Design a protein around this nucleic acid. Structure first.
Lengths: 50, 60
RNA sequence: UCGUGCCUGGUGUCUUGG
């Protein structure tokens, strides 16, 4: 149904989008249950240490 | 004192849900099991250990 | 009188060095 599929593709939109980039303006952040934000592919190469 | 406020509030949230799950059955509820010891004992011990002045889930 | 060998830690934070 359109509503449940929309929830599936929006949360899919969230996980795929957070994979590359875990720093969105006005968007929740991907975090491990171990209490830390995930290092996305962009975070592997963004900063001074990437 | 800043800590102990929040840590005591947490345990009032525990005893809350524990009273609820138990009255709704129409049974009676017991506070000894409701009292989550690991709030104080671990929160203190945590903040004094890491240095993070907060809760473990909002530690950033 | 004998014949086998590189395993091997990641994450954060405070202190301190020029």
């Amino acid at each position: 149904a359109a509503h449940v599929i929309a929830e599936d593709v929006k949360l899919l939109q969230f996980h795929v989008a957070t994979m590359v980039d875990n720093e969105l303006p006005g968007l929740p952040r991907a975090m491990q249950k171990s209490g830390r934000p995930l290092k996305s592919l962009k975070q592997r190469l963004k900063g001074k240490e990437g | 004192a800043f800590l102990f406020r929040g840590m005591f509030k947490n345990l009032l949230k525990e005893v809350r849900i524990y009273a609820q799950k138990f009255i709704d059955r129409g049974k009676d509820f017991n506070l000894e099991l409701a009292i989550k010891t690991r709030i104080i004992s671990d929160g203190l011990k945590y903040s004094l250990a890491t240095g993070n002045w907060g809760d473990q889930k909002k530690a950033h």
